[PDB]
Every structure is written in C-alpha cells, then in structure tokens.
Design a protein around this ligand. Sequence first.
Ligand SMILES: NCCNC(=O)[C@@H](O)[C@H](O)[C@H](O)COP(=O)(O)O
Ligand SMILES: O=C(O)[C@@H](O)[C@H](O)[C@H](O)COP(=O)(O)O
Lengths: 556, 556
Amino acid sequence: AALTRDPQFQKLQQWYREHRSELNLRRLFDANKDRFNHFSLTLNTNHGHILVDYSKNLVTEDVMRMLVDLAKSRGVEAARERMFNGEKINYTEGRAVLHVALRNRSNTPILVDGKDVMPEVNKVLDKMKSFCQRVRSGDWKGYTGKTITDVINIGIGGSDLGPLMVTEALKPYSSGGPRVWYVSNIDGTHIAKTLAQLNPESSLFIIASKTFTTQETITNAETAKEWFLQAAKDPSAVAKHFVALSTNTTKVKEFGIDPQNMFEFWDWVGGRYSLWSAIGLSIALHVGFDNFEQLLSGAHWMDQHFRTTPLEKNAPVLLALLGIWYINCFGCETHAMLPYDQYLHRFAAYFQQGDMESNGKYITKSGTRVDHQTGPIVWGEPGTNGQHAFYQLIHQGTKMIPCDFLIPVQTQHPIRKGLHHKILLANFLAQTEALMRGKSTEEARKELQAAGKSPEDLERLLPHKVFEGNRPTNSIVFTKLTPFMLGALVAMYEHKIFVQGIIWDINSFDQWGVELGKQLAKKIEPELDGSAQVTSHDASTNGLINFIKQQREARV
Amino acid sequence: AALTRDPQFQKLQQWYREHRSELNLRRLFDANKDRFNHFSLTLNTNHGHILVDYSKNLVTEDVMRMLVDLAKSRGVEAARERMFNGEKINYTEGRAVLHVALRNRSNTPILVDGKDVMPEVNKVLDKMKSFCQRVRSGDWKGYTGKTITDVINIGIGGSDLGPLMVTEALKPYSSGGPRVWYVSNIDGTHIAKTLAQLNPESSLFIIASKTFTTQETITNAETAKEWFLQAAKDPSAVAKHFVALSTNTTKVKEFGIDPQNMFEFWDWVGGRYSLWSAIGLSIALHVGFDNFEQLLSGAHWMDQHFRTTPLEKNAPVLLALLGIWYINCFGCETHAMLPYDQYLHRFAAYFQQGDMESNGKYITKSGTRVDHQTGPIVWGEPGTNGQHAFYQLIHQGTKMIPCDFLIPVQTQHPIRKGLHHKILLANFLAQTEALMRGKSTEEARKELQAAGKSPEDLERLLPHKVFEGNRPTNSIVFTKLTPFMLGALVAMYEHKIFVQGIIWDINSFDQWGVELGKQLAKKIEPELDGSAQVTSHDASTNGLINFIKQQREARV
Ligand SMILES: NCCNC(=O)[C@@H](O)[C@H](O)[C@H](O)COP(=O)(O)O
Ligand SMILES: O=C(O)[C@@H](O)[C@H](O)[C@H](O)COP(=O)(O)O
C-alpha cells in the first residue's frame, strides 16, 4: 500500500515508538497551562457555535505537526477539490461523489460530464417543497378525501437510516407535520406491526430506493400496496397514497406509481450520503421544507468550512487525523460516538453505517492489498445511560477506545428551570475529565480510610477501586441542536470519513459487500421450500436449513 | 495474572502460533463431511428447540479439546457451584450472585447467611402477580376512578434496559396490557416528551432503583410526581399512581411512596441481571404474569442446562470458550450480536451492558493487574438492515469480528403466506455462508465476464469485488421467540459472560466505573451556575465550562 511507503507516516510511526510512554494527560495539562487553547477549535456558523475540544487526546505540538504533514503528503487538499469539482473519484463504479452538490445553497456550478447538475438538484427540491406544502396543509387529499395524518417510508440502509435519524433528532420541530414511520427490515414484523396502526384513507407511502430493485424494499412496498388495495379496491387511488424516490424511472412506472409521483436523484448520490437528496422527503414532510432547507444550509456551511480552512485548523481534517493516529499507531479497532442527547439516539447508528460502509475496505486505488489498518468499528449509545453500562470497560477494561462526547448547550426542553440539562452538562464534563485523570493507588487509599475500613479489608479492595486514567476524548459542544446545526454536524463527520479514506488510499464510496448481499439470498431461497433434505451447500448451511425445515410446523 | 500462568492456556497459545495458517474454513468443510454434527448443539427445552451451530468457527477437534481443558484448569465447574450455592463470589462488595434464584421454579433451597432466599423471592412474585391482575383487569383505579392505560418505568441502566428489551421483544404478547414507556436519561427530553403524551388520570409510574439514590432516576421521579400533582392536587393520590422497586425501604417511604406500593429485591440481584426480579414488573404488567412466569421458566431451564451438562456439550460454556479463543489468541477487540428479528432490536444493546459492564475489568481476584485481554466490545443491529451497512467492514474490512447470528424458525407475523420470513431466513443463511467461503479472484472474474465487461475495465474492477472469506460465525436458531425461549436465550448469554470472567480471574459482578460515575458530577454541578469564569479544574474542563456559560445566553 501507498500509505506505509509515505515518508511522513514512517516519521509518525517512529515518534510513537520512541515517545509513547511520555504521552500522559495529567502530566501534559499541568505542563502546558494553555493546552485547551493550543488544542481546540471554535467555529462560528452564525446559526450557533461549535467547540471541538481535542485537548483531552494523546497528542503534543509535534504529533499534530506530523499528522498535518501526512495530510499534505497523501494529497488531501487535491482529493477534496476533485470531489467538490465533480470528478469521478468513485473509480470502481465510474461515478462522481456529490452529496455536497445536493446542499449547495450558493448555487455555484458543479460539472459532471460537462453539464451543471445544480438545475436538476434545485428542480427536485422545488417539487419536494410543493409536495410537502400540499400534504402538510391538507391540499393533497386521500382516496376518501381525507388529509394525510401518517407518512410511511419504505426503504433499507441508506434509503432508511438518514431520514430515520434526522426525524428522530428534529422531533420538536415536527409540530403540524404528519407522524413518520420507518419500515426497513424484510422481517414481516416491521411492515405488519406498522400497517396494524395505520388507516389507509389517511396514509402516504414513500418507496425510497435508488435502484428500485432491492428485495427488502420492493417486497415491503408490494405488501403495503396489497394492504392498501384490500380496503380501497381502486387502482387509481395508488397515485394518491404512493410516491417513489429513485434514479430508475422505468422500474418506478412498472411498479404502478404515477410518473409525476417520482422524486429523482442521481448515481453520484451514495445511499449513506442520500438524506440530503430526495431520500429526505420524509424529513421535509415531518418538520417542513423550511427546516429541511436549514438542514442543507448547515451542511453547506460545513462543506465550505472544510474546503476553505487550512488543514491545521480544519474541523473534519483534525478529527480524521486523530483517528489515523489511534488506528495506525495505537492499534485501536473501535471508535465510540457518545451524544449526550436523547434526540440523537440513532446518531451513533447512522455513522456506524456512514463510517464502516465507507472505510471498511482492504484494496487501494491501484488494486494492491493494504498492509495497514483501515476503518474502525463505530458504535455508541446516548449519555448518560452509557455511564451505568459499557463505560465500565472504557474506564477499567483492557482495550483503548477513543470517544467522541457531543452535547448541545441549549436544550429543547428546559423543564424544572433547566435542572435536567444542568445535570446532563455536569455529567458530560465530569466523565471526560475522569477518563483523562483517573484515580491513583494513593487517592483510592485515602478515600477508603475516611469511610471506615480495616487494614486487612482495605488492601484487598484497593486495586479494584483504582482508575488508570489516560483515556482520550473529543468534546464537541454546540449551541443548540437545530436543523442547521445537525446538518453541520452530520457533514463534519461525512468529511472526517472522506479525509481518512484518502490517507488510506481506499475508495470511501464503493460498497461491494452490500452489493454482494443483494445477490446471495437467491441461491438459498428456492432450497427452503418443501420438507426435502438439502445437501447442495456446505455442512453448516445444509444442517441449518434442515433444522429450519424440521422446526417449521412444530407446535410451541 | 493467573490465566497467563496456566499450563493449558500456554498449550493453546502454542498451537495457535504454529497452526494458524492451517485454519481455513473452506478447506475444513470439504475435509470433514460431518463437521456440522461434530460442531453443533441441539437443545430441546420442551418449549422449543435451540440449535447452536458453531461449525463456521476457526476451530478443529484439537482446539475444542484444549479449550475444554482450560475450562477445567481454571475451575469453571467449581466456580459455577459457588454461584448456584449462594456463596459470596462478588468478593469486592461482599455479596452473593443469585439472579438464578429469582427464576428458580423448582423452589430448591438456596442459602444466603444460613437462610433460604426462596420464600422471599416467591413472596415478591405473588405481590407482583396480584398487582398485575389488579391493574390489567381494571380493579386498580386512578384518582378519578379510571383504569390504567399507561405504565411508565423510571430507571436507568439495569433498572431500565432489561425490561425495555423484553417488552420490545415480547410485544405481540401484550394484548390487553397497558402501553409501556421507559424514561431513563437525565436529559429532560426523555421525561418531557413522555409526559406530553400521557394523561395523569390513567398513568402508573414505576420508580425502578436498587439503591433509590441515583440522581437520574430520583430527579426524573420528582419531575413526574410534580407533573402528576399539578393536575391531581391531592398528595393521597400518589399511592394510586406511583410504585417503587427497591432494596432500600427507608428511601422509598421518604420519597412519598406508600410502603405497600414497594416491590422488594436484594443486593445479590445485580442491575444487569435484575430483569428477572421486581425490576421486571413493567414486563409482567405489559404481557401478563403468566408470560413473565414463562420468561423465568425459560431462564431456569438454561440455568439447569448450564449446571448439569458436561463442559464439552454445554451451551454457554462452548460460546464463552470460542470468545476466549478469539480475544486471547486472535486479538479480537469486538463481538457482534446480530439478531434476525425486529422484536430483538434492543437485544445487542442489552448485552452491550451485560457483557461489557461485567467483563470490562483489569484487576484479578488476588489484586494483581492482568497481562492479557479481558471482555470485548459488544455491539450489533438486527438483520437484514446491517447487510446494507456495517457488514461491508465485516466482509471487506481489516478487522476480525466474530459474529453471533440469531433467528427464530417461526415468525410472530407470517404475512403473505410466510414470504417475508422465507426471505429473512434465506438472508440469515446466505450471509453466514458468504463470510465463511467468500469469493476468489477466479470466481469474481467469471461473474464479471457473464454480465458483460471489457478486458481493460474488468481487470481494474476485479480486486475490489474479491472477498477473502474465512470469517467466523455462530448460528443460533430457535423454534419461536416466545417468553420462555427469550428467557433461555438471555440466561444462555448471562452464563457465557460468567464462564469468561472465571477464566480471566476477574469479578464479573462488580461495577467500579459506574459507581464512580454516580459521584463525579457533584464537583462540577455548582460551578455551572452563574456567568463567572471557572479555573478550579484542568485547562480542558475549564474551557468547556466557559464555552457552555457563554453559549447559555446566545439566541438561535
Ligand atoms: N449489575 C449492575 C448493572 N449496572 C448498574 O448497576 C447500573 O446501571 C444500575 O442499574 C443503575 O445505576 C441504577 O441504579 P439503581 O438501580 O437506582 O441503584
Ligand atoms: O449504503 C447503501 O448503499 C445501502 O444501505 C443502500 O442504501 C440500500 O441497499 C438501499 O438500496 P437502494 O437505495 O439501492 O434501493
């Protein structure tokens, strides 16, 4: 791989191997009095501030210098320009990568195959706006002439997780919008338990699918259509209760959806970057097109910040480089995203798709296998809940986990005169601090003595109450979680992923594993029907199928 | 540490270092025709079957022999007996570990301080049963004489995640039960968005807290009580709408809860093992006490299976030992739990608490630091959704992740004459297979040629569509996800965790980490009030607080 061959990478690996033991957070904070100032970024978006405090990380002045040097050496700025200019950086599929275009509020031209994509981008948005205004008011009526109370998105993966996470995150902005439902799994539970709660007279179905061929989405869409027509009995009513979000015009019309009920997007819109496109119609229906514009505007601000800011002060760039430092030097397999916000319960899950589906690769731009670590395993749950659970392994486990702590300063619900948010903020701060400093053998001994413990019981219990500390955190604090701020935060991580993949020399925009998954369950599918034994596969698969066939009619 | 010193452990490490390259799944399955039979367990509970297919793992006959040898050498059977007999195996806190007692349907005596715990266990269950029957029918009325339509659990961690996961998993058994709500986070969003949907005339609040001191739970409980009394105006009505689940009798009465509205449990009931106790009152209210009995009965079956089965055929034992093999030899930081069931969406999250809060340790039984890896990072999301996302890093990443695939044979919703479940089953099977076999350079070349690709475009795209394979899976197939089967499945993993912690010589039942978290916020809490700058902490913490104080009075 090209990365292991790089001179700045080898310089960074050499420093790490020599000065690893001298990287102590408690020792560094009382050495450099202005460490916070030297290792933090204040971003003013004019719609809220973002503090990216990376001072609780295992870096000095020299380490950040070398990491910035690697970004230049791997050609991050050049690669960035190729993306924003509309060049075909998704080489494996022969596609541009333009999620940035979907939110380009400046309307500055972006050229794909000598043609500006912007007029078509803005046209779909206009169609979205009109549709939303029509549905949300009551202008768009059902087959019985009833106003839409329920919006149902049928889609999986990128055609699901984006709008799900965003509608959950921006829930208090959904006043006077219809309820949103998200059917994704093939599991009949998902579609069945949903339809049992809906009335077909006042329900709108959205068939979110880029290809419009995906088994899960199409099957779920056909079931809903069958469920709807069982009560309506009129094929003409489908044009009132069904809309599609796709690139494939032929497949949409073939399904039975009116060609004027289709909201287009393009192949340079990857699934895990599609919420910004027509895929976000469910978001725009829930919180309104105004808030959806604000969402795109926030992302736009972050795109502009990423493109114009020097690398040493660039937010997604610095976050990405801290990642490289822990993955390719410290050996960290994981990266934890811990939002101190209940609206952001699906945030960690969204970037579990976003990051892992992008940087979960092993083949370079040339075609050679990598001889270094690529993308991490991304996971997390909102605070404070995690403190009472997995934080135990973070504080006292045997594995290093770099964490991203995130929190709005202002809460959507300032109940009890701000008492709940005050505790939430206090906990946010205290936890990052505790991970940094810890509790020594002497500090634990003094605490046990004041409470009341005998020298025989105290000494046995002593090492168990000791916290080694020296665990790295990023503290990302923002003014308020508004549509705009969420847009900026999502886009920040989008480019964080992008920068990492460029350094690793991998394609962050192909998905050959998920492409494989869409073909696999066609070989096994016919072999499940009947009661006859299967031997066409390996010993494991065969045995599994025969067990399934056996247990199929068993009374329990 | 005692583990690294063990002779069987060193024998296993030596085999791994010599015969790592000879462990190829494709090579093994066409060598041993009956590999499935040699590496799988069929368990008949008489309330459904469980197939634990561990044949897709990187083990031979010799490896399983050595792993069983390590279990004996570390004294797993002896330690097991100490737990079930009521001995104080939670040495650090001086407590027994008896979640197994809470579900002991045989009623065989278990002695703690020379006294049988069973009569007190069964007494709380009787009180639970009566209360449930009273509430679910309509016998227990509100302050306005209205029947309870809404049940709200206020608790965090172990006082939350168990009942949440179980009520979500057993949702189709909740017919004629009240709706269940789960408030956990201190974040005022959680409590506020809930109360906005409830009517205080028909709402029952459950204050789930072992200690009854926890800041999150108590604050959330006080807010709900204040919200209730704002509409009721009578302190006597609190005895009609508020109940407590605790060990502390004094704290419950102090809060204002009637002493006859308390459902007791004990200190040998750890939070992450408390769903079985009075903590599961929300479960019993939702699906009924009969189904809650079935849940405990299923766990009981699994406890009995764990206690009586020889180690080489024991389910939690084998699953635990495969974990040790990947963590302490292969170096795997993570373990993925992937249920192919939409009712089990919180299953992976529950064991993220269960496993990580138990085995996230670094100090032995003696007090010495470990010189080996302990518990993994546990994560996952339900199938098939994951296939379109993070499975990319599982199939083509640079990190080894052992996966547990789980699926019921029978579905709660067999819609479209079983079409949805057929696809779900097909996908379950095809994915575990693909991870095992993969796709070679020649297999990928032949597929691209049949579709239609030029020799110049085909060769550039070829290495990117190649799957190395040789990725381990466990396929756990069960007849149906019923209250009983869920109980067995949860208990299976409970003991899996237990066996692992015994081999590592750590205390799987202490939680210094979470106990630290409950004290940390006290120092920062008063320093947040006002607009004055803070300098009492380190540079990072100080800067963070001053940013918060600044953005407090911004308007967006
Ligand atoms: N087995 C321990 C599991 N993990 C925990 O102890 C915490 O999550 C515990 O459940 C919560 O902190 C709740 O505390 P309380 O129940 O009010 O005393
Ligand atoms: O990340 C992805 O690309 C996947 O999650 C896809 O979004 C998913 O396969 C949906 O299918 P499509 O959008 O192609 O209809």
